[PDB]
Subunit: 72 residues, 2 copies
C-alpha cells in the first residue's frame, strides 16, 4: 500500500519521444503504476509500488537517455 514517487529527467524532444515512453510505461505488468509525463519539462513522474531500479531499467531499455532520477 505504500506509493513511491519517482521522477526521471529523460531526454524527450518530440511528442513521439514522450508518447513512446508513455506507451512502454503504461503497458508495464503488473498494473501497479500511474505515469505522468511532461514533454515540456522533460520529466517522467512514476507513482508505483515497484522499486526504483526496476522502473529506471524499463525506461533505459527504451533507448532514451535518462539524465537523472530520484525518489520524492
Amino acid at each position: 500500500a505504500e506509493i513511491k514517487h519517482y521522477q526521471f529527467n529523460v531526454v524527450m524532444t518530440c511528442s513521439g519521444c514522450s508518447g513512446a515512453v508513455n506507451k512502454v510505461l503504461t503497458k508495464l505488468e503488473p498494473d501497479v503504476s500511474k505515469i505522468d509525463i511532461s514533454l515540456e519539462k522533460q520529466l517522467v513522474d512514476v507513482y508505483t509500488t515497484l522499486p526504483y531500479d526496476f522502473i529506471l531499467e524499463k525506461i533505459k531499455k527504451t533507448g532514451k537517455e535518462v539524465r537523472s532520477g530520484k525518489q520524492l
Copy 2:
C-alpha cells in the same frame, strides 16, 4: 549462418526517436550489422542472423510505432 536483410518503417519524428532505435539495435551486435537508420525516410535497415520477430520485438521496446517491415 543465413544473414537476412530487414527493413522497417518506424515512426521516428526526431533525432531522439532515431537515436533510441539506434541504441537498442547496437546492443544486438554482433548479431546485427550495417545498422542504417534514416530519420528522413523513417526507415531502419539492418543485416542480421536473428529472426525477424526477435528484431521486431526489440525495436518495439523503444515504444515507437512500427508501421511495416520487409525482408529484402
